[PDB]
């Protein structure tokens, strides 16, 4: 849906136009705009509190933002940990079919997710990181073959949307490639961790469509 504004909010926002307050609009409003379409109550309550606080103490949002940016290395550490954990297969992906072809697919999916989760600990040595990138390539390569080997040969259930998750996996796989290239110019490693964690999620979605 869409956030609603009270009269008191309307008044406050109109009285809050000095330059120190622009980060409310330039950074927080786009956030509230995205939040709106998945979590309406949070978006509205958070905007409400931000607007009142900003109006009564202009500069507050800028202060909060700068302090969040200051704590960047907490977030890098946190994102590293998310990635490391992402490989911990819940055993709800493990294919219930005893066939060697579905056993082959599980192992190659565990393989790829395993290497990707170790990125935080290889990235600081260019030699080891280059190897890791090579291992990722072989893992992706070997998984796509097993998908294709099981695709035409076996299943073809009620869902042929298994085709789309391969198209998605590839799209996300190509995107991770771009992020690596961007990192080797930026040094901003957080983009790589975020990107590796998405590819893991996509690998899981392939494994989910075979069950449900």
């Amino acid at each position: 849906g869409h956030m609603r504004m009270t009269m008191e909010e309307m008044k406050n926002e109109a009285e809050t136009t000095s330059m120190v307050s622009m980060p409310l609009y330039a950074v927080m409003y786009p956030v509230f705009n995205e939040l709106e379409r998945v979590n309406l109550s949070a978006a509205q309550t958070l905007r409400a509190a931000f607007i009142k606080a900003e109006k009564e103490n202009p500069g507050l949002t800028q202060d909060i933002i700068m302090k969040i940016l200051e704590k960047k290395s907490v977030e890098v550490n946190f994102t590293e940990s998310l990635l490391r954990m992402a490989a911990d297969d819940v055993e709800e992906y493990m294919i219930e079919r005893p066939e060697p072809e579905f056993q082959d697919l599980n192992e190659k999916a565990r393989a790829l997710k395993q290497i990707l989760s170790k990125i935080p600990d290889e990235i600081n040595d260019r030699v080891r990181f280059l190897q890791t990138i090579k291992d990722i390539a072989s893992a992706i390569k070997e998984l796509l073959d097993t998908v294709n080997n099981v695709f035409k040969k076996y299943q073809y259930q009620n869902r042929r949307a298994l085709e789309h998750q391969k198209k998605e996996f590839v799209k996300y796989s190509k995107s991770f490639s771009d992020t690596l290239k961007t990192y080797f110019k930026d040094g901003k490693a957080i983009n790589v961790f975020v990107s590796a964690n998405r590819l893991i999620h996509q690998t899981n979605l392939i494994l989910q469509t075979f069950k449900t």
Partner: peptide
């Protein structure tokens, strides 16, 4: 090392 990753995405 970077080559084979670029060679894979080229096939796709």
């Amino acid at each position: 090392a970077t080559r084979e990753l670029d060679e894979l995405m080229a096939s796709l």
